[PDB]
Amino acid sequence: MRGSAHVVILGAGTGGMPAAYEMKEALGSGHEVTLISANDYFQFVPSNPWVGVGWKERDDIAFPIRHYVERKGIHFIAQSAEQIDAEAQNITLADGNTVHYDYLMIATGPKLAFENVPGSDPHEGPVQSICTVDHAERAFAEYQALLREPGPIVIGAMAGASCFGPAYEYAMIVASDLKKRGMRDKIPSFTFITSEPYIGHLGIQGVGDSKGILTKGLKEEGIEAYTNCKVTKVEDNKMYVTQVDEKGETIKEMVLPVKFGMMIPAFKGVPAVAGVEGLCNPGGFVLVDEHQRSKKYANIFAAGIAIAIPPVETTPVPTGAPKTGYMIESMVSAAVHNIKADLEGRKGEQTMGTWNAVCFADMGDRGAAFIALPQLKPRKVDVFAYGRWVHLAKVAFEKYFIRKMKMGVSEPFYEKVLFKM
Amino acid sequence: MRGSAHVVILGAGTGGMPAAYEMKEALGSGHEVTLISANDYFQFVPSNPWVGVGWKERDDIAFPIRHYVERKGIHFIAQSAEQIDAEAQNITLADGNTVHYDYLMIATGPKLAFENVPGSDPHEGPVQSICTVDHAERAFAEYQALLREPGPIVIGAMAGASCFGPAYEYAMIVASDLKKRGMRDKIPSFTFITSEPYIGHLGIQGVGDSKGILTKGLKEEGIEAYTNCKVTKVEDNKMYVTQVDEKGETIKEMVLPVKFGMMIPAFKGVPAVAGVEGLCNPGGFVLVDEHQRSKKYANIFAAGIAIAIPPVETTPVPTGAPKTGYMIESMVSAAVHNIKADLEGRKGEQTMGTWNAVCFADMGDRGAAFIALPQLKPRKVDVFAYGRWVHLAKVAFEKYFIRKMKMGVSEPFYEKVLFKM
Ligand SMILES: Cc1cc2nc3c(=O)[nH]c(=O)nc-3n(C[C@H](O)[C@H](O)[C@H](O)COP(=O)(O)OP(=O)(O)OC[C@H]3O[C@@H](n4cnc5c(N)ncnc54)[C@H](O)[C@@H]3O)c2cc1C
Ligand SMILES: Cc1cc2nc3c(=O)[nH]c(=O)nc-3n(C[C@H](O)[C@H](O)[C@H](O)COP(=O)(O)OP(=O)(O)OC[C@H]3O[C@@H](n4cnc5c(N)ncnc54)[C@H](O)[C@@H]3O)c2cc1C
Ligand SMILES: CCCCCCCCCCCCO[C@@H]1O[C@H](CO)[C@@H](O[C@H]2O[C@H](CO)[C@@H](O)[C@H](O)[C@H]2O)[C@H](O)[C@H]1O
Ligand SMILES: CCCCCCCCCCCCO[C@@H]1O[C@H](CO)[C@@H](O[C@H]2O[C@H](CO)[C@@H](O)[C@H](O)[C@H]2O)[C@H](O)[C@H]1O
Ligand SMILES: CCCCCCCCCCC1=C(C)C(=O)C(OC)=C(OC)C1=O
Ligand SMILES: CCCCCCCCCCC1=C(C)C(=O)C(OC)=C(OC)C1=O
Ligand SMILES: [S]
Ligand SMILES: [S]
């Protein structure tokens, strides 16, 4: 309303949950902050591969949201948005109720585009997913069925994927868990299929010696690896794979039987968002300026995987660059600042800062991690690390981030760099 | 004087130069800041290996100090301190004049202890040094004489050394320069001798895969490498080397002829400082608290290589852990803050923060670098990197640091982390 704006945050995920707390903190009791999300629970996404192999339980990485945001003065609606009318500024929910907003911050993350590859939906066949806790639990279940009746395994990333790390993580921990159970030698074949032009490209043209280390890692585990691949369909428990050359011409086709599989799908924008006329690129990603503000609607901001980021490269098989946690938090922070400035006469000048990618993977006793910035080479920082300490660090962050989501955020998150003083 | 303290900074090096500017900045026109140093010029120490092989010139990495500090209100005395009387608070200079101080900040760096190994002084034989620009120029001269009359090369680090990176850097760029000149095959033998218990220990129990990468690096260049070594003497153009086992027992002795050599010496405290009764440990390093204040004299602070840091390990051949730039700058910053607090009633609470080590080495087209913290494993950060970008980064820092030394320091130096916004 006039003088008491209603700010709606769409999606309670890695960007959206912190955004709710930071928004309420920044605005105070004079304005209304409402968080709207498809699920009634928060989940720590980087832990999903471990759930998918059974090293973690849902209850470890997920919790109900309502009480934690409400104790902070934030309204929570556990309902999916089905339609957004940007002209009238009304959101229509699954149940048919509509919610008016003065500002909308979209943090809806990715739509998992299984439709790109007929038969690839985890409910349609043997190729599973570890992108969500619902999918990871399902993947483990299928993993157990593999144990009962051993057969070929196929893990990897689809054409158009942007999130490659989890594919490698999952393959390594599956190989490890097989050994730990003494079942590894019952597997007919273990294949790694990726849309990357080479092993360890990671959608970022490689980082440190990611290529040499991931290549040798897969070999060590007796995992056969193919690059420049796209899966055309999954059918009759078989994966149909087409491999191209640098010029995108077929150098071979393969038909791989799968008893158990997991392929990272391409990400698109969610339908309710993609469906807003003139808001998104053809992929369904919100077109924003450096201040995180929609280029079409002044009262619409966006953050996280939901936003569009121009490609810097064009690979033989389409691939994308990942949008990761540190950059997402900078996006959120910028959006909150600029919305507040809008509510106070100023035009917020805050930006996301320099593009970067940061990823951690835990293999059990030790981990791998990388930092790359900015996007194009030669970089200012281009590092890949492996060791027991990386494992200890992922463990620590998960427990920290989760506690933070229950307690509140009133400061710049990554003051985590207090381990210097 | 009363109400207008005289603050003396001893040593215009990596810690001492910034300390002068930061001290004057912090204190203002009400107090007197005097910088006293053995040489009339500043030198960028990490560039010395390159001078030693002729890839850089003195004029590139060194400049006269007087004008730059004086334009800032700082007094400069280009004279070595020979005696410090801590009771009377008088410094006696080489010329015999004495300077009274109310506060003394010691930043005198290392004494290069060539005396530990008879015949090792660069002026006494074939084993040279790249620790100072005077020594690096001399080393290059000897390098040219090697070119005219090829013979065995020996590079490495002595017992008690704490600065291992430069040894590896120097060996690699010597090997490279030999190739570039087409002289590499005229060398009878190229040996690497170190006091480290293994290749890439670096005085820090290794960092990332420093071991595997430095080992393979030396092999690639046909450099034969021996660890757990100490040099007992240099004599008749021969290096007498004793190699021990884990229990410090001799497993072999070697006599190596040297036409051209470079060994990093052990560091001790400088005589004028070590000579202050009750100030130093037996090595000549100033015993300080967490606030950088002498444990014996309240008006004496210290920073940089000059301070004592307890060992965390005890290797078969004595070795030390390096004191590097980021930590040194934190020491300086802490000292300046706490002296100012002293001049204003408060007890300064500022500390150096977490122990860390950071080193960059440039091989020509690409570089190697590491970050380790804290001192003991498992660490919070333990990373080793290599690439063209590391080279570009060392180049950039040298030019930045040098400009900063000419222009002044009024802020926390490493706001260099502005490459994020
Ligand atoms: C398996 C995996 C591992 C990863 N590991 C790392 C890592 O180690 N480090 C790192 O920095 N990044 C990692 N990422 C990348 C990244 O950070 C995450 O994907 C992160 O959760 C994305 O943040 P987000 O807020 O943009 O999307 P999300 O976290 O997916 O949140 C989006 C949310 O909005 C909701 N939603 C969607 N549509 C609607 C609708 N119509 N109405 C209401 N709500 C809706 C969702 O249900 C959800 O809560 C990983 C990603 C995956 C898939
Ligand atoms: C070859 C080499 C390469 C290195 N590379 C790196 C690197 O890449 N990164 C990193 O973080 N560190 C590096 N270091 C380690 C370190 O940072 C440096 O040694 C640094 O210069 C030390 O700072 P300092 O102020 O303690 O000593 P110094 O820089 O040596 O300054 C000490 C000073 O005080 C003076 N002095 C000594 N005695 C007296 C006296 N009696 N009276 C008056 N003045 C006196 C000196 O002449 C000198 O100016 C390197 C060191 C060496 C030797
Ligand atoms: C999170 C980013 C995305 C990546 C996710 C996928 C992770 C895949 C894991 C592959 C690693 C397996 O291979 C592993 O590589 C490391 C690094 O060279 C080796 O480890 C080597 O370097 C490390 C430090 O970096 C040393 O501590 C070690 O002593 C040395 O042998 C291991 O000997 C090898 O077992
Ligand atoms: C500054 C810290 C102290 C150390 C100073 C001494 C430096 C010594 C240099 C030795 C490096 C030589 O060996 C070199 O190692 C790197 C890293 O594995 C290899 O490079 C490998 O990893 C890098 C990234 O990390 C990739 O860009 C590269 O494609 C890959 O091959 C090179 O193929 C090899 O030539
Ligand atoms: C962009 C410049 C470097 C950023 C600093 C990275 C280190 C601080 C925490 C990083 C981090 C960790 C440890 C981590 O485990 C993790 O996985 C959940 C991340 O993703 C959100 C992280 O961003
Ligand atoms: C302790 C935690 C990490 C510190 C941040 C390191 C990166 C910023 C500059 C580092 C640096 C560079 C690049 C460098 O080239 C260099 O050599 C002269 C150093 O020594 C003084 C450095 O400290
Ligand atoms: S990734
Ligand atoms: S070093």
Side-chain angles (χ1 to χ4, degrees):
Chain A
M1 71 200 193
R2 234 186 75 151
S4 179
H6 187 201
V7 178
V8 170
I9 291 146
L10 224 213
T14 298
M17 270 267 270
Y21 288 124
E22 298 176 44
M23 190 72 74
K24 183 58 177 185
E25 182 79 42
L27 259 32
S29 47
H31 308 278
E32 184 179 8
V33 172
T34 306
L35 176 68
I36 307 185
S37 199
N39 298 323
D40 66 17
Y41 63 90
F42 169 90
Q43 63 183 273
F44 191 70
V45 166
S47 283
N48 279 329
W50 280 39
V51 181
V53 75
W55 288 1
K56 285 199 159 79
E57 297 279 44
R58 172 187 290 256
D59 282 271
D60 296 326
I61 79 166
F63 66 84
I65 289 154
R66 182 166 305 287
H67 176 85
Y68 304 104
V69 299
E70 287 186 357
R71 74 189 290 168
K72 233 66 182 190
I74 301 164
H75 304 279
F76 182 61
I77 305 179
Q79 189 110 228
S80 182
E82 292 309 301
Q83 184 205 308
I84 303 168
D85 180 345
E87 292 288 319
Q89 310 177 194
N90 287 336
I91 306 171
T92 300
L93 308 173
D95 73 7
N97 265 20
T98 122
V99 169
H100 181 89
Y101 66 83
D102 299 303
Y103 287 85
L104 172 59
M105 188 187 300
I106 290 162
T108 44
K111 178 216 185 168
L112 309 171
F114 299 111
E115 71 270 8
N116 289 3
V117 183
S120 75
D121 188 280
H123 299 274
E124 277 175 340
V127 186
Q128 296 303 294
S129 163
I130 52 61
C131 294
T132 73
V133 69
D134 282 355
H135 286 172
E137 281 183 329
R138 183 178 178 84
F140 184 58
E142 309 291 66
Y143 177 68
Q144 285 163 308
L146 163 77
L147 271 352
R148 291 191 298 275
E149 311 191 9
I153 295 174
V154 186
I155 291 165
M158 297 296 199
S162 46
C163 199
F164 298 92
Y168 292 95
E169 182 177 5
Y170 197 58
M172 294 303 297
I173 67 186
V174 167
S176 163
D177 187 83
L178 259 1
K179 291 177 189 177
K180 205 136 54 178
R181 287 177 187 254
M183 213 75 48
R184 180 63 182 91
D185 33 280
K186 275 85 173 186
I187 304 299
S189 55
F190 195 146
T191 314
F192 189 84
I193 296 298
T194 181
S195 56
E196 302 162 275
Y198 54 89
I199 296 300
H201 174 281
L202 295 164
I204 59 178
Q205 302 76 60
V207 52
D209 201 8
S210 61
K211 182 179 177 195
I213 290 161
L214 276 46
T215 294
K216 146 167 248 176
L218 295 181
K219 188 198 183 76
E220 236 152 42
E221 306 295 334
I223 303 176
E224 196 174 58
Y226 298 88
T227 53
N228 283 316
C229 291
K230 71 207 307 166
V231 189
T232 56
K233 71 182 175 194
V234 180
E235 189 179 73
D236 293 320
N237 303 284
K238 300 190 294 181
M239 188 182 301
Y240 293 67
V241 184
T242 297
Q243 187 177 36
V244 296
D245 61 31
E246 303 165 316
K247 300 219 292 277
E249 307 262 294
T250 302
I251 57 110
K252 75 173 172 269
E253 302 176 352
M254 290 184 293
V255 186
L256 302 174
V258 185
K259 171 64 179 164
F260 172 71
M262 196 294 296
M263 295 289 281
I264 305 293
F267 293 165
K268 292 181 178 177
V270 307
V273 170
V276 179
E277 189 181 356
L279 185 70
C280 300
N281 69 18
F285 296 100
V286 185
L287 294 159
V288 298
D289 60 21
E290 289 174 8
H291 308 97
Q292 306 301 139
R293 189 193 303 260
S294 156
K295 288 186 173 167
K296 186 138 236 65
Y297 295 103
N299 55 358
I300 300 186
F301 288 75
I305 283 173
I307 76 151
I309 298 184
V312 293
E313 194 202 0
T314 175
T315 50
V317 178
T319 66
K323 304 157 181 166
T324 58
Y326 189 86
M327 195 175 60
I328 289 166
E329 181 51 39
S330 300
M331 299 192 199
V332 166
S333 173
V336 166
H337 181 278
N338 300 326
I339 284 167
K340 176 181 190 171
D342 252 44
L343 287 167
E344 294 176 359
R346 292 115 51 185
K347 182 220 170 184
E349 274 293 355
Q350 187 173 336
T351 74
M352 172 189 101
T354 303
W355 184 103
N356 60 86
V358 180
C359 188
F360 282 65
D362 197 341
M363 259 75 271
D365 289 317
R366 37 209 56 145
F370 69 68
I371 302 189
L373 77 288
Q375 198 168 5
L376 249 4
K377 294 173 178 281
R379 299 188 164 125
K380 290 177 180 309
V381 175
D382 190 69
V383 177
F384 190 101
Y386 179 96
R388 209 207 334 171
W389 73 272
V390 175
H391 149 67
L392 292 171
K394 178 125 189 200
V395 166
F397 187 75
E398 168 176 17
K399 140 174 289 291
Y400 177 77
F401 195 96
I402 289 185
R403 181 176 56 101
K404 259 252 313 194
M405 293 305 83
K406 298 176 181 182
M407 285 180 53
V409 184
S410 55
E411 76 313 308
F413 178 103
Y414 295 77
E415 66 92 12
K416 241 237 167 185
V417 194
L418 64 30
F419 72 161
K420 300 311 290 70
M421 293 184 56
Chain B
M1 71 200 193
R2 234 186 75 151
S4 179
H6 187 201
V7 178
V8 170
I9 291 146
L10 224 213
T14 298
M17 270 267 270
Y21 288 124
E22 298 176 44
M23 190 72 74
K24 183 58 177 185
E25 182 79 42
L27 259 32
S29 47
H31 308 278
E32 184 179 8
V33 172
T34 306
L35 176 68
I36 307 185
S37 199
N39 298 323
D40 66 17
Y41 63 90
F42 169 90
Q43 63 183 273
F44 191 70
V45 166
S47 283
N48 279 329
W50 280 39
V51 181
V53 75
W55 288 1
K56 285 199 159 79
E57 297 279 44
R58 172 187 290 256
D59 282 271
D60 296 326
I61 79 166
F63 66 84
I65 289 154
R66 182 166 305 287
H67 176 85
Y68 304 104
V69 299
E70 287 186 357
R71 74 189 290 168
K72 233 66 182 190
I74 301 164
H75 304 279
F76 182 61
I77 305 179
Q79 189 110 228
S80 182
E82 292 309 301
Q83 184 205 308
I84 303 168
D85 180 345
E87 292 288 319
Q89 310 177 194
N90 287 336
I91 306 171
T92 300
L93 308 173
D95 73 7
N97 265 20
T98 122
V99 169
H100 181 89
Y101 66 83
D102 299 303
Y103 287 85
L104 172 59
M105 188 187 300
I106 290 162
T108 44
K111 178 216 185 168
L112 309 171
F114 299 111
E115 71 270 8
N116 289 3
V117 183
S120 75
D121 188 280
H123 299 274
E124 277 175 340
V127 186
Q128 296 303 294
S129 163
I130 52 61
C131 294
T132 73
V133 69
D134 282 355
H135 286 172
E137 281 183 329
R138 183 178 178 84
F140 184 58
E142 309 291 66
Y143 177 68
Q144 285 163 308
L146 163 77
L147 271 352
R148 291 191 298 275
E149 311 191 9
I153 295 174
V154 186
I155 291 165
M158 297 296 199
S162 46
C163 199
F164 298 92
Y168 292 95
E169 182 177 5
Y170 197 58
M172 294 303 297
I173 67 186
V174 167
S176 163
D177 187 83
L178 259 1
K179 291 177 189 177
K180 205 136 54 178
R181 287 177 187 254
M183 213 75 48
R184 180 63 182 91
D185 33 280
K186 275 85 173 186
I187 304 299
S189 55
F190 195 146
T191 314
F192 189 84
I193 296 298
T194 181
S195 56
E196 302 162 275
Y198 54 89
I199 296 300
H201 174 281
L202 295 164
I204 59 178
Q205 302 76 60
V207 52
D209 201 8
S210 61
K211 182 179 177 195
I213 290 161
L214 276 46
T215 294
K216 146 167 248 176
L218 295 181
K219 188 198 183 76
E220 236 152 42
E221 306 295 334
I223 303 176
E224 196 174 58
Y226 298 88
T227 53
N228 283 316
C229 291
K230 71 207 307 166
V231 189
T232 56
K233 71 182 175 194
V234 180
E235 189 179 73
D236 293 320
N237 303 284
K238 300 190 294 181
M239 188 182 301
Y240 293 67
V241 184
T242 297
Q243 187 177 36
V244 296
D245 61 31
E246 303 165 316
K247 300 219 292 277
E249 307 262 294
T250 302
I251 57 110
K252 75 173 172 269
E253 302 176 352
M254 290 184 293
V255 186
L256 302 174
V258 185
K259 171 64 179 164
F260 172 71
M262 196 294 296
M263 295 289 281
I264 305 293
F267 293 165
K268 292 181 178 177
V270 307
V273 170
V276 179
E277 189 181 356
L279 185 70
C280 300
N281 69 18
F285 296 100
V286 185
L287 294 159
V288 298
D289 60 21
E290 289 174 8
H291 308 97
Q292 306 301 139
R293 189 193 303 260
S294 156
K295 288 186 173 167
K296 186 138 236 65
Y297 295 103
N299 55 358
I300 300 186
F301 288 75
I305 283 173
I307 76 151
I309 298 184
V312 293
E313 194 202 0
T314 175
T315 50
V317 178
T319 66
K323 304 157 181 166
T324 58
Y326 189 86
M327 195 175 60
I328 289 166
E329 181 51 39
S330 300
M331 299 192 199
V332 166
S333 173
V336 166
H337 181 278
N338 300 326
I339 284 167
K340 176 181 190 171
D342 252 44
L343 287 167
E344 294 176 359
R346 292 115 51 185
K347 182 220 170 184
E349 274 293 355
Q350 187 173 336
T351 74
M352 172 189 101
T354 303
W355 184 103
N356 60 86
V358 180
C359 188
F360 282 65
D362 197 341
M363 259 75 271
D365 289 317
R366 37 209 56 145
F370 69 68
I371 302 189
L373 77 288
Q375 198 168 5
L376 249 4
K377 294 173 178 281
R379 299 188 164 125
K380 290 177 180 309
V381 175
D382 190 69
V383 177
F384 190 101
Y386 179 96
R388 209 207 334 171
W389 73 272
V390 175
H391 149 67
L392 292 171
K394 178 125 189 200
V395 166
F397 187 75
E398 168 176 17
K399 140 174 289 291
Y400 177 77
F401 195 96
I402 289 185
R403 181 176 56 101
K404 259 252 313 194
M405 293 305 83
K406 298 176 181 182
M407 285 180 53
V409 184
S410 55
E411 76 313 308
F413 178 103
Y414 295 77
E415 66 92 12
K416 241 237 167 185
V417 194
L418 64 30
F419 72 161
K420 300 311 290 70
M421 293 184 56

